[PDB]
Design a protein around this ligand. Sequence first.
Ligand SMILES: NC(=O)C1=CN([C@@H]2O[C@H](COP(=O)(O)OP(=O)(O)OC[C@H]3O[C@@H](n4cnc5c(N)ncnc54)[C@H](OP(=O)(O)O)[C@@H]3O)[C@@H](O)[C@H]2O)C=CC1
Length: 271
Amino acid sequence: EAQTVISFHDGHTMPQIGLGVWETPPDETAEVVKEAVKLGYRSVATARLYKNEEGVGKGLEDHPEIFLTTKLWNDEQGYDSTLRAYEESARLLRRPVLDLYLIHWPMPAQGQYVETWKALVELKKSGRVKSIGVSNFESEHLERIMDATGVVPVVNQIELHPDFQQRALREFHEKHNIRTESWRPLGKGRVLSDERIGKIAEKHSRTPAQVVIRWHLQNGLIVIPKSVNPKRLAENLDVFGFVLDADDMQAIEQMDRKDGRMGADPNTAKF
Ligand SMILES: NC(=O)C1=CN([C@@H]2O[C@H](COP(=O)(O)OP(=O)(O)OC[C@H]3O[C@@H](n4cnc5c(N)ncnc54)[C@H](OP(=O)(O)O)[C@@H]3O)[C@@H](O)[C@H]2O)C=CC1
């Protein structure tokens, strides 16, 4: 069955599934991309941090058909320094006008991140990026920037996966037309082997992962899972051949913990 897409308040539209490009090293980046596209992967997403925009922009030579996301790193923040940052990402990536552009972290102690959003609202008023948004923002932080500059980011990317469901923030999100991208959507693989998922993947003749990748799907979550082993790739991507029930859905909802965070607390994270 054909895939799905999620759309944005700014009227653009992004496939609800895509490929993560975390870690995967610069020279194999090139390779792994094409290999992936050939699977029917429609979106790609990397970040500046990983420094494989070059490998992506070669990898995606003569594949404009595909939704390309990238993230402005923390040492490039402010107004004039972000515009600069964008051109160059666009250069290494090679698609002067990109699909999605994300502010990697707020870094609120660094206080320089609202400056950073104007630079963004600019790039879209120019129409030099298609769709702008952020990564790892809170209530406090988004409110702060929607009041400062009157435009909501289309997407805020955040940590989330069965053991952490930021339902507070997905309440705030939903109430501002904001799309919510899952970061580390398998809780780093803790759930690969969780026993609630050893029944629900049996049930539907699938592996534990897909089960969950789908969870994200059936929550309206743009999800961007990363593998290299192409067996996994086309596995992750084959998540439309089925569907789940509320017996299922409200059974993976019990997996949420208050303490389920595993990464930087973006309020407190220092780099
Ligand atoms: N500050 C922060 O916010 C934090 C960030 N991180 C970052 O997150 C990243 C960690 O990546 P990771 O946790 O591995 O990503 P995920 O949460 O996506 O973990 C899932 C892992 O499972 C594997 N996998 C993918 N598809 C399948 C499949 N079909 N069957 C079985 N296994 C599969 C993948 O590895 P494989 O390629 O082997 O398939 C993947 O690495 C790092 O960049 C790390 O620094 C970590 C902690 C905190």
